[PDB]
Amino acid sequence: GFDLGSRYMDLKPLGNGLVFSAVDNDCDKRVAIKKIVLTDPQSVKHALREIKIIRRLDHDNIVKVFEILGPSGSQLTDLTELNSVYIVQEYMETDLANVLEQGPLLEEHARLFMYQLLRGLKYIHSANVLHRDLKPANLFINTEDLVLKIGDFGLARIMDHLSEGLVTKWYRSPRLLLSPNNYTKAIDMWAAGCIFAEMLTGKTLFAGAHELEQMQLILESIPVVHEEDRQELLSVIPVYIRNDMTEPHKPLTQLLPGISREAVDFLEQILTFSPMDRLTAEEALSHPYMSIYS
Ligand SMILES: [Mg+2]
């Protein structure tokens, strides 16, 4: 119903209305608009890093950016003299989290979406861009075409007051839990493995409520095969978890009951404890299970 600037019309919020649907009046096309509130200098730094990363990305499996708007909704030409900025971008029908709320995918859909996620990751990793917040809610779906696009580069960095409690732990790799300051390509790949499993089952694979429970759940199901890893872990993790990892639990195959052997075998090459053993996005795309799409 509301106008933003001289160009965007019929703004309707898409609980938390900082994300709107709007019509671009120069084309009469539906777009998405994210309002970004510039509160602190830690909020200006997060806005600017996000804007720089998203501007440089054009790929079939990445949400397109159209425009950056200033507080009044007029276009920016290239800013801590500003209370707010808007990001105008491709309107997407839904996100993978909304899809998985209605149950698991057929393997054929999970596989096709995985092939798109990996193609998106190969691209952003080639630009040395780490996403750092891969989860179903940041994977946008057009259901008619079965197109998956990676969006919400809010937490993204060029590889080179935490709000820790607002970051979901479910898609975090063992190395990210042990070494929290350092994002890597391999950390994105671990999250893609967890998202593949969730598409197959409709359930979070490792649903820990904090870092420690997340590590416990991963150790219950994923073996530590390198001595170097085992020694680091033994010196960091508490007694009850160390006890728990010599107790019997379900392996990956039993967390994915009735899923084809080929899907589980592919997944076992992504959900390796060590990133040294883990398929890169490029290696994953060239694995037989995925090369059927190439
Ligand atoms: Mg999101």
Residue numbers in the entry: 13 to 26, 30 to 93, 98 to 179, 187 to 320
Recite the paper's sentences:
Thus, we determined the crystal structure of the kinase domain of this atypical MAPK. Overall, the kinase domain of ERK3 adopted the typical kinase topology, comprising the N-terminal lobe containing β-stands and the C-terminal lobe constructed mainly from helices. The two monomers in the asymmetric unit were observed to form a dimer in a head-to-tail, face-to-face fashion. However, we expected that this dimer was likely induced only in the crystals, as the kinase was observed to behave as a monomer in solution as determined by size exclusion chromatography. Detailed structural analyses revealed that, as expected for an unphosphorylated and ligand-free state, most parts of the activation loop and the glycine-rich loop (P-loop) of both ERK3 molecules in the asymmetric unit were disordered. Nevertheless, there were several features that displayed an active kinase conformation, including an “in” conformation of the tripeptide motif DFG (aspartate, phenylanaline, glycine), as well as the canonical salt bridge contact between the β3 K49 and E65 located in the αC helix. In comparison, the overall structure of the kinase domain of ERK3 resembled that of the classical MAPK ERK2. Detailed structural analyses further demonstrated high diversity of the residues of ERK3 and ERK2 within the ATP binding pockets that typically engage in inhibitor binding. Key differences include (i) the substitutions of the bulky Y113 and the basic K114, located in the αD helix of ERK2 to the smaller A116 and neutral N117 in ERK3, respectively; (ii) the change of ERK2 E50 to ERK3 C28 in the P-loop; and (iii) the alteration of the residue preceding the DFG motif (DFG-1 residue) from C166 in ERK2 to Gly170 in ERK3. Unfortunately, due to the disordered P-loop, our crystal structure of the kinase could not provide the exact position and conformation of this cysteine.
Extracellular signal-regulated kinase 3 (ERK3) is a poorly studied member of the mitogen-activated protein kinase (MAPK) family. Similar to ERK4, ERK7, and NLK, ERK3 is classified as an atypical MAPK. Despite potentially important functions in cellular processes and tumorigenesis, no ERK3-selective inhibitors have been published that could be used as tools to elucidate the roles of this kinase in normal and pathological signalling processes. To contribute to recent global research efforts on untargeted human proteins, we present the crystal structure as well as the discovery of inhibitors of ERK3, providing a foundation for the development of selective inhibitors for this poorly-studied, atypical MAPK kinase.
